[PDB]
């Protein structure tokens, strides 16, 4: 426990027993409020030494869909709660390295990306290079998955932009790790679904942040042309050449329409070249003529765009509802078959039927380290397909229909041998985890668990190992 506090307060227990998915409700015995890493070590150590080893799970912002951060009858470590004035003054300044050829910053494992951003911009105009679409997620939470957005095609996911970690293992041991120090734990933890320890520190790579963003959306009716254009755009920038700084897309609720979403970053030095750069890049595209929608805004406002949508949804009582999300990594070689079978088949053209946004965009696997625990398709270019569904509140039939639609999509992929992989997996059954990881990766994953959390105390809500 040390400097930390073990809370049984009704409101803390309630928050720790729920998540964004709004379905899973496993209750903890207590909520731990640490002051520092040693306190998390002391709590995990005590769980490891106890007779009936209680579950310990870290909670970031509680954005999990199916109880991943829940610890039934155990202790939930509230990593993202502010630690007071002394903690805020003690946060590390960005540091320059001549060996790395740039700056990095050490952050608490529970820090929200929005707070990491505000801190680094205020200390040199620096910022992380690779984002999530939503900044009110914890660093520890995203690094336990991958952390993806429109920059991942170029910079890789957030797990490719971290130099070092401090990890509290399932034995309560504080271990510093990186590519050159305890690499098995470092690569194990990155994308490791919280299985091998709690990240108490992360050393994030930084770049000089742009000031403004030219934010563009364009429409397509031809899927083959929409995907050919996204794939061409993600192939640009090799050797720092001319490219867009963000590439996403989404299916439009109208035939089916698709929207390409791109940005071009700029500052005072590059403001003179933006318009010509954008025009050249757009002139090479095949979008429907006259369907370009452009907005110009500060970098921070573009990065926080989803939080702006959240405030609007909260005011309408549309945020705190069930979210039966399904996130897939789909091989580019089978993306046309996925569009036919799912956007035009399962969804029948009306999406609409999806119950919320459906993101679609490709990434470059070479930007992902093959040593990490993250599971990607067995192909170089693969797409995120994100079914960001919201069920109607107080409507059980709405959640049932969306959960069935998820199952049909999964059965379609398995039946036609698509080779898709779930991102933020919610498998829970043993043979499905084996198939998710594959033979070589499952063996490696089980070996890391035996070494780092033999009692299966950590992140039991993921439902991989018997606690
Ligand atoms: C709700 C949501 C999620 C989201 C998103 C937008 C919204 C509105 N946009 C995303 C995006 O564009 N790109 C992306 O990669 N992910 C996106 N997400 C999903 C999000 O990454 C996940 O929900 C993720 O879990 C992070 O959320 P959060 O920080 O709230 O963490 P958690 O849900 O409580 O816990 C997740 C798992 O990790 C373990 N955990 C938590 N903290 C730690 C630390 N410090 N160390 C180790 N493990 C940790 C939890 O126990 C749980 O298993
Ligand atoms: O959730 C998102 N991305 C995500 C989520 C889970 C896994 C991978 C990507 N992005 C996002 C974009 C616009 N509106 C909203 Cl509510 C959300």
């Amino acid at each position: 426990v040390g400097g930390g506090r073990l809370s049984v307060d009704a409101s803390d227990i309630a928050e720790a027993s729920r998540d964004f998915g709004g379905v899973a409700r496993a209750e903890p015995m207590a909520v731990f409020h640490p002051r520092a890493a040693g306190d998390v070590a002391g709590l995990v150590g005590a769980a490891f030494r106890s007779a009936r080893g209680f579950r310990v799970s870290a909670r970031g912002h509680g954005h999990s869909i199916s109880g991943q951060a829940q610890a039934a009858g155990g202790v939930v470590v509230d990593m993202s709660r502010g630690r007071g004035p002394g903690a805020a003054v003690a946060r590390a300044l960005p540091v320059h390295s001549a060996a790395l050829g740039g700056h990095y910053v050490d952050v608490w494992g529970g820090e929200l990306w929005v707070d990491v951003l505000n801190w680094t911009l205020s200390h040199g105009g620096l910022a992380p290079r690779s984002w999530t679409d939503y900044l009110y997620l914890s660093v520890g939470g995203t690094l336990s998955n991958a952390g993806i957005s429109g920059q991942a095609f170029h910079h890789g996911p957030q797990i490719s932009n971290v130099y070092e970690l401090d990890v509290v293992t399932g034995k309560g041991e504080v271990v510093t790790c990186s590519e050159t120090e305890n690499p098995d734990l470092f690569f194990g933890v990155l994308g490791g679904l919280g299985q091998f320890g709690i990240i108490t520190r992360a050393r994030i790579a930084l770049e000089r942040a742009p000031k403004r963003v030219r934010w563009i959306r364009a429409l397509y009716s031809n899927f083959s042309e929409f995907t050919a254009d996204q794939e061409r755009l993600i192939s640009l920038g090799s050797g720092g050449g001319r490219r867009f700084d963000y590439v996403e897309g989404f299916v439009v609720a109208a035939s089916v329409l698709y929207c390409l979403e791109v940005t071009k970053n700029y500052d005072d030095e590059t403001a003179g070249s933006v318009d010509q750069d954008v025009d050249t890049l757009l002139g090479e595209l095949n979008f429907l003529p006259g369907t370009v929608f452009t907005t110009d805004l500060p970098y921070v406002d573009f990065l926080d765009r989803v939080h702006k949508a959240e405030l609007k949804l909260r005011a309408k009582g549309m945020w705190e509802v069930p979210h039966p999300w399904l996130n897939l990594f789909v091989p580019a070689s089978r993306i046309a078959d996925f569009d036919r079978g799912v956007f035009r088949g399962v969804l029948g053209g009306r999406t609409a039927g999806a119950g919320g946004p459906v993101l679609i965009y490709p990434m470059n696997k070479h930007k992902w380290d093959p040593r990490s625990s993250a599971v990607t398709p067995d192909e170089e270019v693969f797409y995120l397909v994100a079914f960001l569904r919201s069920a109607l509140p107080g409507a059980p039939e709405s959640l049932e229909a969306l959960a069935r639609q998820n199952q049909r999509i999964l059965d379609f992929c398995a039946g036609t041998g698509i080779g898709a992989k779930q991102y933020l997996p919610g498998h829970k059954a043993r043979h499905e985890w084996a198939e998710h990881f594959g033979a070589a990766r499952w063996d490696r994953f089980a070996r890391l668990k035996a070494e780092f959390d033999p009692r299966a105390i950590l992140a039991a809500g993921q439902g991989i190992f018997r606690p």
Side-chain angles (χ1 to χ4, degrees):
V1 178
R5 183 181 73 98
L6 199 69
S7 167
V8 193
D9 179 75
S11 237
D12 290 344
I13 294 290
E15 285 287 312
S17 60
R18 69 187 196 90
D19 58 28
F20 188 72
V23 181
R25 46 170 181 90
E27 222 177 288
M29 183 214 169
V31 179
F32 190 69
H33 294 138
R35 275 202 82 255
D39 304 329
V40 177
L43 178 84
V44 178
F48 175 68
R49 290 182 297 271
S50 64
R52 287 108 96 264
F54 59 90
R55 299 175 190 196
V56 174
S57 291
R59 184 191 206 260
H61 203 58
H63 264 264
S64 287
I65 297 303
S66 60
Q68 288 97 329
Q70 297 176 3
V75 178
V76 165
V77 182
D78 185 354
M79 289 296 284
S80 297
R81 184 189 177 95
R83 300 165 294 120
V89 62
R91 66 201 141 137
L93 291 169
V95 169
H96 181 265
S97 172
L100 301 175
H103 288 82
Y104 59 75
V105 67
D106 283 331
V107 305
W108 172 244
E111 206 69 5
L112 300 187
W113 288 100
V114 63
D115 294 321
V116 173
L117 180 59
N118 281 327
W119 182 253
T120 61
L121 292 173
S122 67
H123 302 278
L126 297 162
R129 307 167 183 147
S130 182
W131 294 104
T132 55
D133 300 329
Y134 181 65
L135 310 179
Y136 289 75
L137 299 173
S138 71
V139 167
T142 72
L143 294 183
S144 291
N145 287 288
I148 57 170
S149 192
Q151 305 83 16
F153 79 89
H154 180 77
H155 280 118
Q158 297 182 321
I159 59 168
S160 299
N161 290 281
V162 47
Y163 292 116
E164 189 171 281
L165 306 169
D166 282 346
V167 174
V168 169
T169 72
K171 294 181 193 175
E173 183 185 9
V174 179
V175 184
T176 300
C177 61
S178 70
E179 189 184 348
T180 54
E181 183 175 11
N182 299 113
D184 296 323
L185 182 64
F186 180 71
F187 291 115
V189 165
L190 300 170
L193 313 170
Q195 296 307 293
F196 317 114
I198 293 166
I199 303 166
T200 56
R201 180 174 63 86
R203 182 166 285 185
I204 308 308
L206 301 171
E207 64 175 2
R208 290 177 286 267
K211 297 162 179 142
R212 304 193 68 81
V213 159
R214 189 61 52 82
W215 177 17
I216 305 131
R217 285 185 175 178
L219 298 181
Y220 291 75
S221 56
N222 189 314
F223 188 74
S224 186
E225 288 181 342
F226 168 71
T227 53
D229 277 359
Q230 288 190 311
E231 291 180 32
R232 200 183 133 267
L233 293 176
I234 69 153
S235 73
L236 301 174
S238 345
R242 185 205 242 101
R243 64 179 187 96
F244 281 120
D245 301 291
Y246 166 112
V247 176
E248 287 200 12
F250 53 92
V251 179
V252 173
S255 54
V256 185
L257 306 173
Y258 312 89
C259 176
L260 170 66
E261 182 183 58
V262 298
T263 79
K264 193 82 188 78
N265 286 350
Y266 73 101
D267 59 28
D268 293 330
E269 285 181 319
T270 61
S273 71
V274 206
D275 302 301
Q276 296 179 124
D277 284 349
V278 168
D279 272 41
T280 294
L281 287 167
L282 296 183
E284 292 172 319
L285 304 181
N286 297 276
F287 51 77
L288 292 162
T291 74
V292 185
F293 303 99
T294 307
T295 306
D296 185 278
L297 80 173
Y299 184 51
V300 172
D301 298 296
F302 171 73
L303 293 172
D304 211 45
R305 69 199 180 285
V306 178
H307 182 62
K308 300 172 191 286
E310 167 186 6
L311 296 168
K312 251 95 183 76
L313 290 168
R314 285 189 174 271
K316 296 190 278 167
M318 281 158 70
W319 186 252
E320 291 174 79
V321 298
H323 295 104
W325 285 8
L326 172 63
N327 295 284
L328 290 170
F329 289 156
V330 183
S333 67
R334 301 299 297 279
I335 201 66
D337 284 337
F338 191 91
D339 168 70
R340 282 191 282 273
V342 178
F343 306 144
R344 299 170 181 275
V346 173
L347 278 156
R350 53 98 53 176
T351 162
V358 177
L359 311 183
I360 175 166
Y361 62 89
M363 283 167 285
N364 291 128
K365 193 180 177 181
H366 76 86
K367 304 288 188 163
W368 295 64
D369 196 304
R371 295 168 297 183
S372 94
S373 288
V375 175
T376 55
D378 197 19
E379 183 164 316
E380 181 53 34
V381 176
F382 64 87
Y383 284 75
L384 167 72
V385 184
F387 296 91
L388 310 171
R389 340 188 171 271
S390 281
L392 300 171
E397 74 281 7
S398 171
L399 178 56
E400 293 165 357
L402 301 172
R404 254 193 321 277
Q405 203 192 108
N406 288 344
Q407 200 54 64
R408 291 200 185 96
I409 295 164
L410 295 171
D411 294 345
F412 166 74
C413 291
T416 66
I418 279 183
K421 297 294 188 172
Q422 282 184 225
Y423 175 50
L424 313 177
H427 294 299
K428 274 128 255 271
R430 190 57 67 100
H431 77 278
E432 286 163 350
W433 280 111
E435 170 66 39
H436 171 75
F437 285 103
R441 291 183 122 278
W442 174 258
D443 176 63
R444 178 118 187 93
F445 206 78
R447 285 186 187 273
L448 288 169
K449 192 78 181 178
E451 180 163 41
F452 304 115
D453 183 20
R455 297 252 281 163
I457 281 326
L458 307 172
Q462 293 273 1
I464 310 164
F465 302 97
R466 264 66 267 177

